[PDB]
């Protein structure tokens, strides 16, 4: 239902993080740990940004 | 360079500049000191500083009133080099969060994510700054020596 919404990030892994919104896309391909494709408009020490995610996380509001 | 100048200004003077009087006798800004009181390393603080600087040390309420006003904020800004030049770099970035919380949580904060000055960039200041610092200083200084005992 939430495809790329204002959804949170929540694991002792990240950079940005609490920082809210955005799950952009989500796959259906099972193996890994990395289903949750995030892109915001705020950045770590790369520039392309967007690195991937999932599992013990999205502990969020609307 | 910020040596060599030096050697010069204690030759021209002390042992070249003069004045006149008369009985065969030229009389220099300072003594034929030098010869044997600029051998020893020291001789240049005994007699190249606190023997000079007097010029600038006192030198307020006057017109030496800039060279009593430069190497001040020229010593700091010889100084405010090492802070960027002895310092770390990750240490500083690591920092500019912390504060960040203040703006952000209280929503102000940039988006030109205020990162902390790039390594080279701060081997691009304690270079300029050091290297602005101990110059003026010595031009805040060497100056005001010359003119009244000049």
């Amino acid at each position: 239902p939430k495809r790329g919404s204002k959804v949170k990030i929540l694991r002792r892994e990240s950079y940005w993080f609490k920082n809210v919104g955005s799950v952009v896309a989500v796959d259906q391909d099972p193996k890994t740990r990395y289903p949750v494709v995030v892109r915001f408009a705020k950045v770590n020490y790369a520039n392309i940004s967007t690195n991937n995610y999932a599992l013990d996380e999205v502990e969020e509001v609307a | 360079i910020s040596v060599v100048i030096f050697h010069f200004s204690w030759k021209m003077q002390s042992d070249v500049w003069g004045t006149i009087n008369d009985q065969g006798v030229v009389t220099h800004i300072t003594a034929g000191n030098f010869a044997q009181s600029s051998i020893t390393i020291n001789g240049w603080l005994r007699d190249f500083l606190w023997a000079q600087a007097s010029q600038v040390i006192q030198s307020y309420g006057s017109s030496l009133s800039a060279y009593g006003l430069f190497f001040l904020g020229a010593h700091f800004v010889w100084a405010f080099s090492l802070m960027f030049l002895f310092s770390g770099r990750g240490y500083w970035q690591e920092l500019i969060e912390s504060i960040v919380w203040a703006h952000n949580k209280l929503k102000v904060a940039p988006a030109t994510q205020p990162r902390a000055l790039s390594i080279v960039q701060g081997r691009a200041v304690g270079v300029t700054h050091y290297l602005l610092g101990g110059i003026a200083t010595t031009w805040a200084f060497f100056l005001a020596r010359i003119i009244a005992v000049g």
């Binding site: - | 020291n42 603080l45 005994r46 040390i57 309420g61 006003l69 001040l72 990750g90 970035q93 969060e97």
Partner: protein
Amino acid sequence: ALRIPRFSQGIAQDPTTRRIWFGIATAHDFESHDDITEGRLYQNIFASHFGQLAIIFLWTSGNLFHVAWQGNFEAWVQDPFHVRPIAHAIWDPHFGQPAVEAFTRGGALGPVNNAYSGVYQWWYTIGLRTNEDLYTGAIFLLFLSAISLLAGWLHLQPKWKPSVSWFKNAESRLNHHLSGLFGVSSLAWAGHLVHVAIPGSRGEYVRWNNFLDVLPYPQGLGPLLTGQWNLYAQNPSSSNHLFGTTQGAGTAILTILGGFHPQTQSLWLTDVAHHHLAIAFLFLIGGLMYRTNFGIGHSIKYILEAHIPPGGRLGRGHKGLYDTINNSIHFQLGLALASLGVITSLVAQHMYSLPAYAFIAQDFTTQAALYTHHQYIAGFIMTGAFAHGPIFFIRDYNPEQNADNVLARMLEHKEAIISHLSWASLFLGFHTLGLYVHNDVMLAFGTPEKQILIEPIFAQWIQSAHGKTTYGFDIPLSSTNGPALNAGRNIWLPGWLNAINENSNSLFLTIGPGDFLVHHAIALGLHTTTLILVKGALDARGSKLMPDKKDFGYSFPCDGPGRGGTCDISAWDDFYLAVFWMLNTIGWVTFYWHWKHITLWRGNVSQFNESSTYLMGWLRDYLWLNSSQLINGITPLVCNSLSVWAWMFLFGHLVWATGFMFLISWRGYWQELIETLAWAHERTPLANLIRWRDKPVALSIVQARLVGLVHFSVGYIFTYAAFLIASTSGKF
């Protein structure tokens, strides 16, 4: 490939100069050193931390032994005050015949050092002026030297072994261990500062020997028992009584109201003989607070998990910290420099503000000597005191043995202490320092008339109520008839007023204007020689840059180009930076004092007051003037007796300086180069048959920041060091 040295394979097989750095350097690092059971290090420290107890004890059995040889006490007894307080005897086979013109000083006959260790009074006080009754403190701090290395030799033996448990036990190592440690220690002390010192201050070869057939108090040992005492405070040693002498020698013992009498100029004897004989009971309650066996007295524990109040109908819930401060040694080197932190600084004036012996308040050479020192450890203990304060974090703390209680919480809300200790400074950044600068503009531009020197209004309140009656301001107490100074108008409060203000008293010093211009500045320093610390410590738990320095540790040498956004990054190398700004923050509060104080000892107290409120004042005539006695006891004629720092100083002024290459001149410029000729001398014949045991490399970047620090500071501990002394033996 290279088996030696030891502790671990790692660096002991390693084949470059490192080993020797990375032997010697990391050589008391054992608590992460592959060779250590749960004892081994706990085991270690013990002998270890006797061990030095040894030399501290051979620190002085000598230098005691040293004097009476050397110097001239048994002499100096005839007349007690000039002087050139006398250190050691200097066998320096380079010194030009002018060894006469050198240091044929005090009692000499040889180019002796000018002693400044104070002590020479701390010994005059306890008792002796007879060095034939020295020879012994020597032999005693030997009676402790050999003796205690059996605590060495021996209790470093599984048999009369230690445990580990025995070490973690809290309520014994502590509770019991106030009572002994301090407690009793005084008594006899508290009493020696009573029963062997009095009788010379009365004047009497009391010695040991005649050790009962004295009875310095007439009424034996009665009223002590009984319930009646004031036949003791009875007639204080009195008013003129040339000190430790004849006349006015008003027998009494345990006194506690008078204080100084101009002559000693120094807290009068056996009126701190009641002091040491009171503190006691203030642990000898809170000193049988807990335990040994017996089922009565304290646990601690619900001290917390109940007593987390002050806190909790919300808040923090302690459910025990403990298994942390008792499991995590650090804490035992978290707070045993941490708090023997403070003491250093609250000894850094008590010790002066009112002395304690054979004349120092008017020596102006201890103060000079025996101060800054006792300050620089309030540095070098107070600092590197939070270091073992990151540690437990990345190297004792488990976020889960604790994440109920304050610390982990402290943490959860940590990026805050950081940023209010910060706003604590950017401000103590512009101000105390913005103002401060037309206080340096005007004063230059003929305009001192107009000027921003805002005179302290606050400290101000104190120092009067606490007695001091010096001009203006019609309030109570020090009224010299006032109702905090009443109800108690005799107890404690004539004497500590009788000397309160004319300066050969220095007591509560004469507050000037801009007095806070440093005072403020010194409540800048700190707030900005923390945060370093309380990062280099705090978030240096992990960060988010590299959210795992947790693994990494405390002492990782920088980082490399890693995504242009990383570098010098040890929580260690935040202690590095921390030890910069602190020596800055001492940088300052030793100017003040020297400026100030110096002022007085030659009457001229426009050596501040007039000046400092605009810094060339500092530079001109704190810094520029006074000198070239020192730096003209060198001066193309000779050397006389202030010769040294004229050397040492330029030393500090070199040995500083070159803590610079290492520093500005980083790492991969050294190898590269030290190759291009580590190489040249590998080709050139005759000195060809020379292949060298290991193989010359440049220096771990840490190091290349360390020996930046111990050439530096060493330089920097130097000079001011030699100056603060130089200075005063010319001018006072």
